[PDB]
């Protein structure tokens, strides 16, 4: 029984994990599986350390439902690049078998329709809004089974609230049939202490495992020694060569080891600076003053859209590199690609990549147990160094806290810590939606039964104001109160078609409804204000940069900011010798000018040099940007707004991909990001009609040239040839003509 | 010879030939085809009687030319509805053979494009646009072969200089390309006079002929009798019975004999009120106080989109009708089938049916010289009585002028006088584009041979500031000016690309560069505001109903009109007590505002009730208002402005059918113009792709409903049966799926 031959798996799938090197299944998973009525329909949630696999028992069992009864199932993932690579993973397992996935993650939609797709793989803000659509026309029947990541993430968090309605609803819509599960509901946690409470809240029963592949042993130094967490000395710290903190001496003794190590740094800048000394020290330390794939690698950077960072300029050619949010969303897969590998053997990170992809290290070492100027939380201290350790290459991983003088204290909390307790989340405009979500979907009519709703969240399941909350939706519209049974408005089924948090629609109806008055068309500025989604804290603003950009904005440009309340005589003038809907407005005003060059395909070094905002977080803006120019085109369409969707509906795809409007056809195939298509389109080929009918040999010089084996890249598949990837565009352009036909 | 079987021809051209009747072969037709070097490619002008078979000759050329080398070629016709009538004709004639003909009547463009397309059956607005294009892309070579229409309109006319620009532009090319024929060019035309000087201008060889295939006989009434033209009694006028003029006399003459008359009107009300009393004196006089097919002819106007008119309700079933200007477009068509048939006897006519499709008729009747307060036209007379005498039935064609008192002397005139001889209509607006259509062309650059092309013009071959023209093209930046050779720019590179004269450009560029700054969106108007061509003489504009109009009218629609420059303080307020620029605003206003109710599905009834202005003066609006939207489309893509294109993209098909956004996709099939789609979308099909895949007995029943054994009417098939058409539209819907994929 304990081989995954006997368990009733498909014949290409068992063939798939072999090539993965999953041939042994743990016994913790074979006795959660087995334990209970899970396989038969009852939920279930369980926990177990990163490192140990969380991922097959959620796959083999939503296998097994696939397999069982034909209905379509979710995927819930919080982050993007998560979501993509695991979209990427389950395609490429379930190509053969017949499961076909696709995903929804933010700006990115299937081609095909959610009928053909069986598991959508795909992000919460948009598990969230698919859900919704498949309550509002009785199509519940498709969903058989939803799978939820980290559910420990439903407590405090930006979006994980999302999560915990959207398994309420379900939980809901589960109970309402029963007047063995219509609806099977999956999760995976880390150490949570309060497991049990949330298990109960779903009826599923509870298995929590500490079980590790390899052992993992956290360590703290003193000085000049390690201490273990138990008030333990475990080994005498000697550094050996080096030129308190001995910070270089770490990675030496692992790399004379041959194997890798991860030194994850605080700051933006503190990242540069450890991974370029590291570098520095191996100059000396190893010539006393794999290269054929680390140049290839430092080749992939090479015709980048950024080109090749000076900081990783003198460190990448020694197997020493870095990675923070700063740094390109491209150049981020590719120095996290060859890690898996083995090409690099230290990095520089931030806490960014606690919570990222799998990024197995022998030894992890954590710079300052301050993070930014706060303390480092207990959560994402699981996940710090739940990295250490290789299953089946690595029999020790190990942790390697550094603390000095009064810090320890603080710093050894977190070693003896526990994860703190979920919560709820839930007047609350974390709830305004929930309530919405259902009362203006048709499941629920009756106030009675609405009140029975909230019996079915996680706050009643953890042991008033719900009531009065729904006549704050009165006040504003969104609900039409009649004989109590309570109705949509125009307002309201819209707000939840777009999947928008009701709060930012009240402003948003007010402002989509202000471009009626005075509208632009001659730039996009003006459809570029009304789809960039916020400020956040995506960049440290310069008003003095802005100033000249002010200035030498065009004519056209200045109507677009006097037209949406910018000022002209007030920016960048009173903050230098010194509200709050005022900066709303000149940040999404900066937000609006830095995507017009995005739409016009300034070069990101150019747009670095002269925005001041570096390529972190220009892609991490039009990402985020892109998903609201899909949600306000939705939230137009069924407002009654016909001609606002229709300026609004080629947005999206523009920002996601930073193009124009001549490469949108060409932009769909998934090969062409933001320059094989521009020089392609160059090349007389203006659409991916005649695209698909391309000379093979054609489309190799073309590509060659424009430089600003596997030499170009392609995300999902890593690095690629040149000859394969250009027959893989004619490829990908084929398979589109008829397929959407 | 004299005989269609010995001259070359397809067998089925000449079966569906003979089906026609057309199977003798005139003298006239044989002596001008086999005369000289016509057939060899040489190019051709002569003149003809109408009813006696101009176009045939023209048919044997084209067939000749399409069958010895393959090129396309093209059809010029006056107006709209006689090219549709003749794109109708040669589409049944060259179904079988290969010949795919298609038709640019304004605002309808065919599917296909021009390189599968053969004969472009297209008015001189359109075909002037289509062969600028073919020029601008040096694809001339598919040209050999333009057949012109009525060459004695391209003297003073309001698009005969069009097609005189046209012709000497083809004549310049061909000249050029001698550095038999390039391209032939054929057409006919009334008995002009100076038809030599227009032969010799083309170079082509002359024939004018007087032929007859019945004779045709004039007359005039003086008291109570009637005289030849040339001072003689032929003769003497007796009224049988009436309850001077006698009108209803000569009518009842030629009913006893079972035959037709048309009695043509002044006015519309003229038209109305003989039209009344000939059926009133048919009451008494034929009952002491074919019926079957008359009722089904009546059953046909039943369920129109207005219904059956009061006044033809009272006089169509008895074998009397009436027809002018204000009728439907619709109703047009079927009074006028019925007349081919024989089934209705007489008729009440202004002056546009003189211009209109073949009507032949026994006698014909002419109330007055004076049509609308001014003298007859020697033109319009000659195919004004040009239908009398049906071929191959009547052995006598037959008009008889109406003339009183004093009258008679100005009456006469029309008798013998002659054709008056054609002008050139070429500082001039109508030669303005005739340069700038060469000159940005890249056809001519050097300005000596733009001196050149003006000596290829009528105005050079009919026997200095022609060179002055340019200056003011210059000036207008139109061509910049370099070392002299000239070279389009921005602008004039799109006028000509839209087919816009250079004179309303001007303003349009102005008109739209102001909704540039500031344009509404909730409401069509504004977008309807840039679309209405003029305010022309399409109706007489009531103030007091505009300005009760204009109280009514919506909040956010009085936000357009105080941002074009209508003003809520003058409108309707300083004309009741009682500045060219304003009427053309305010009347440009008025023109969107009547838009928008046919773009609202308003009934035509009703809106003629509520806009005053009669359905004959609606549906000839809105054809000309949709070549428009098509015009200023095309120019906005041209300048570089994508925006202000997208929402004017779909504003041409949704003026021509007088639809909204859900039905455009339906409209695409030919058989739903305004309401055979909109109670179809009632029926649950919401797009053209699923309703060729209909249940051919479902949408019998939908289709009967709805109603405001041929009873249905589809244009260019006359009457239809409901299964038929039914049949029809799933199949029309059939074949554009896989046509255009």
Same mark, same amino acid.
């Given at each position: 029984?304990?081989?995954?031959?006997?368990?009733?798996?498909? $014949?290409?799938?068992?063939?798939?994990?072999?090539?993965?090197?999953?041939?042994?299944?743990?016994?913790?998973?074979?006795?959660?599986?087995?334990?209970?009525?899970?396989?038969?329909?009852?939920?279930?949630?369980?926990?177990?350390? @990163?490192?140990?696999?969380? @991922?097959?028992?959620?796959?083999?069992?939503?296998?097994?439902?696939?397999?069982?009864?034909?209905?379509?199932?979710?995927?819930?993932?919080?982050?993007?690049?998560?979501?993509?690579?695991?979209?990427?993973?389950?395609?490429?397992?379930?190509?053969?078998?017949?499961?076909?996935?696709?995903?929804?993650?933010?700006?990115?939609?299937?081609?095909?329709?959610?009928?053909? &797709?069986?598991?959508?793989?795909?992000?919460?803000?948009?598990?969230?809004?698919?859900?919704?659509?498949?309550?509002?026309?009785? $199509?519940?029947?498709?969903?058989?089974?939803?799978?939820?990541?980290?559910?420990?993430?439903?407590?405090?968090?930006?979006?994980?609230?999302?999560?915990?309605?959207?398994?309420?609803?379900?939980?809901?819509?589960?109970? $309402?049939?029963?007047?063995?599960?219509?609806? =099977?509901?999956?999760?995976?946690?880390?150490?949570?202490?309060?497991?049990?409470?949330?298990?109960?809240?779903?009826?599923?029963?509870?298995?929590?495992?500490?079980?590790?592949?390899?052992?993992?042993?956290?360590?703290?130094?003193?000085?000049?020694?390690?201490?273990?967490?138990?008030?333990?000395?475990?080994?005498?710290?000697?550094?050996?060569? =080096?030129?308190?903190?001995?910070?270089?001496?770490?990675?030496?003794?692992?790399? +004379?080891?041959?194997?890798?190590?991860?030194?994850?740094?605080?700051?933006?800048?503190?990242?540069?600076?450890?991974?370029?000394?590291?570098? %520095?020290?191996?100059?000396?330390?190893?010539?006393?003053?794999?290269?054929?794939?680390?140049?290839?690698?430092?080749?992939?950077?090479?015709?980048?859209?950024?080109?090749?960072? /000076?900081?990783?300029?003198?460190?990448?050619?020694?197997?020493?590199?870095?990675?923070?949010?700063?740094?390109?969303?491209?150049?981020?897969?590719?120095?996290?690609?060859?890690?898996?590998?083995?090409?690099?053997?230290?990095?520089?990170?931030?806490? @960014?990549?606690?919570?990222?992809?799998?990024?197995?290290?022998?030894?992890?070492?954590?710079?300052?147990?301050?993070?930014?100027?706060?303390?480092?939380?207990?959560?994402?201290?699981?996940?710090?160094?739940?990295?250490?350790?290789?299953?089946?290459?690595?029999?020790?991983?190990?942790?390697?806290?550094?603390?000095?003088?009064?810090?320890? /204290?603080?710093?050894?909390?977190?070693?003896?810590?526990?994860?703190?307790?979920?919560?709820? +989340?839930?007047?609350?405009?974390?709830?305004?939606?929930?309530?919405?979500?259902?009362?203006?979907?048709?499941?629920?009519?009756?106030?009675?039964?609405?009140?029975?709703?909230?019996?079915?969240?996680?706050?009643?399941?953890?042991?008033?104001?719900?009531?009065?909350?729904?006549?704050?939706?009165?006040?504003?519209?969104?609900?039409?109160?009649?004989?109590?049974?309570?109705?949509?408005?125009?307002?309201?089924?819209?707000?939840?078609?777009?999947?928008?948090?009701?709060?930012?629609?009240?402003? !948003?109806?007010?402002?989509?409804?202000?471009?009626?008055?005075?509208?632009?068309?001659?730039?996009?500025?003006?459809?570029?204000?009304?789809?960039?989604?916020?400020?956040?804290?995506? @960049?440290? !603003?310069?008003?003095?940069?802005?100033?000249?950009?002010?200035?030498?904005?065009?004519?056209?440009?200045?109507?677009?900011?006097?037209?949406?309340?910018?000022?002209?005589?007030?920016?960048?003038? +009173?903050?230098?010798?010194?509200?709050?809907?005022?900066?709303?407005?000149?940040? %999404?005003?900066?937000?609006?000018?830095?995507?017009?060059?995005?739409?016009?395909?300034?070069?990101?070094?150019?747009?670095?040099?002269?925005?001041?905002?570096?390529?972190?977080?220009?892609?991490?803006?039009?990402?985020?940007?892109?998903?609201?120019?899909?949600?306000?085109?939705?939230?137009?369409?069924?407002?009654?707004?016909?001609?606002?969707?229709?300026?609004?509906?080629?947005? =999206? $795809?523009?920002?996601?991909?930073?193009?124009? %409007?001549?490469?949108?056809?060409?932009?769909?195939?998934?090969?062409?990001?933001?320059?094989?298509?521009?020089?392609?389109?160059?090349?007389?080929?203006?659409?991916?009609?005649?695209?698909?009918?391309?000379?093979?040999?054609?489309?190799?010089?073309?590509?060659?040239?424009?430089?600003?084996?596997?030499?170009?890249?392609?995300?999902?598949?890593?690095?690629?040839?040149?000859?394969?990837?250009?027959?893989?565009?004619?490829?990908?352009? %084929?398979?589109?003509?008829?397929?959407? &036909?």
């Amino acid at each position: 029984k304990l081989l995954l031959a006997n368990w009733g798996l498909p $014949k290409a799938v068992l063939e798939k994990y072999h090539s993965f090197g999953v041939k042994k299944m743990f016994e913790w998973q074979a006795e959660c599986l087995l334990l209970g009525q899970v396989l038969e329909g009852k939920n279930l949630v369980y926990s177990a350390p @990163t490192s140990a696999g969380k @991922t097959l028992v959620a796959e083999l069992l939503i296998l097994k439902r696939v397999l069982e009864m034909r209905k379509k199932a979710l995927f819930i993932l919080p982050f993007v690049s998560v979501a993509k690579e695991k979209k990427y993973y389950l395609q490429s397992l379930f190509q053969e078998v017949g499961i076909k996935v696709d995903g929804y993650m933010g700006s990115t939609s299937p081609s095909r329709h959610f009928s053909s &797709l069986d598991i959508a793989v795909c992000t919460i803000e948009r598990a969230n809004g698919l859900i919704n659509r498949l309550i509002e026309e009785n $199509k519940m029947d498709l969903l058989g089974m939803v799978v939820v990541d980290e559910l420990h993430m439903l407590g405090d968090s930006h979006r994980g609230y999302l999560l915990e309605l959207l398994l309420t609803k379900i939980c809901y819509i589960t109970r $309402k049939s029963a007047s063995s599960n219509a609806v =099977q509901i999956v999760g995976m946690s880390a150490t949570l202490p309060n497991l049990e409470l949330v298990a109960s809240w779903l009826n599923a029963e509870l298995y929590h495992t500490d079980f590790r592949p390899v052992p993992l042993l956290e360590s703290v130094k003193v000085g000049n020694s390690i201490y273990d967490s138990s008030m333990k000395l475990v080994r005498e710290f000697e550094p050996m060569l =080096q030129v308190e903190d001995h910070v270089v001496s770490l990675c030496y003794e692992t790399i +004379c080891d041959n194997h890798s190590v991860l030194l994850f740094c605080p700051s933006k800048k503190w990242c540069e600076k450890l991974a370029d000394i590291i570098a %520095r020290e191996f100059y000396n330390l190893h010539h006393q003053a794999e290269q054929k794939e680390l140049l290839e690698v430092m080749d992939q950077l090479r015709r980048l859209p950024s080109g090749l960072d /000076s900081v990783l300029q003198k460190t990448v050619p020694w197997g020493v590199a870095f990675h923070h949010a700063g740094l390109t969303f491209e150049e981020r897969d590719i120095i996290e690609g060859a890690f898996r590998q083995g090409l690099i053997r230290v990095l520089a990170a931030t806490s @960014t990549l606690s919570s990222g992809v799998n990024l197995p290290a022998r030894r992890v070492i954590i710079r300052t147990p301050i993070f930014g100027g706060r303390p480092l939380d207990i959560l994402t201290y699981k996940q710090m160094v739940g990295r250490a350790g290789r299953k089946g290459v690595d029999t020790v991983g190990e942790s390697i806290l550094i603390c000095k003088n009064s810090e320890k /204290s603080k710093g050894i909390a977190l070693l003896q810590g526990s994860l703190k307790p979920v919560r709820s +989340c839930l007047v609350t405009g974390s709830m305004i939606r929930a309530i919405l979500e259902i009362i203006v979907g048709g499941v629920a009519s009756t106030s009675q039964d609405m009140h029975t709703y909230a019996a079915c969240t996680f706050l009643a399941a953890s042991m008033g104001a719900i009531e009065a909350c729904v006549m704050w939706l009165l006040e504003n519209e969104f609900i039409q109160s009649t004989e109590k049974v309570y109705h949509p408005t125009h307002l309201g089924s819209a707000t939840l078609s777009s999947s928008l948090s009701p709060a930012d629609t009240l402003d !948003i109806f007010a402002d989509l409804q202000r471009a009626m008055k005075g509208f632009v068309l001659e730039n996009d500025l003006h459809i570029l204000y009304l789809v960039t989604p916020m400020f956040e804290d995506w @960049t440290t !603003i310069d008003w003095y940069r802005f100033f000249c950009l002010w200035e030498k904005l065009p004519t056209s440009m200045k109507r677009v900011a006097e037209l949406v309340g910018v000022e002209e005589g007030f920016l960048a003038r +009173c903050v230098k010798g010194k509200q709050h809907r005022q900066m709303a407005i000149h940040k %999404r005003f900066f937000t609006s000018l830095v995507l017009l060059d995005l739409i016009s395909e300034v070069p990101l070094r150019e747009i670095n040099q002269k925005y001041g905002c570096n390529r972190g977080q220009i892609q991490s803006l039009q990402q985020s940007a892109a998903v609201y120019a899909g949600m306000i085109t939705v939230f137009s369409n069924r407002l009654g707004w016909h001609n606002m969707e229709l300026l609004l509906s080629q947005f =999206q $795809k523009r920002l996601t991909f930073g193009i124009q %409007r001549e490469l949108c056809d060409l932009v769909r195939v998934s090969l062409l990001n933001a320059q094989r298509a521009r020089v392609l389109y160059a090349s007389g080929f203006h659409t991916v009609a005649d695209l698909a009918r391309a000379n093979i040999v054609e489309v190799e010089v073309i590509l060659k040239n424009a430089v600003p084996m596997r030499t170009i890249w392609v995300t999902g598949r890593k690095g690629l040839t040149e000859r394969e990837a250009a027959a893989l565009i004619v490829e990908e352009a %084929r398979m589109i003509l008829q397929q959407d &036909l």
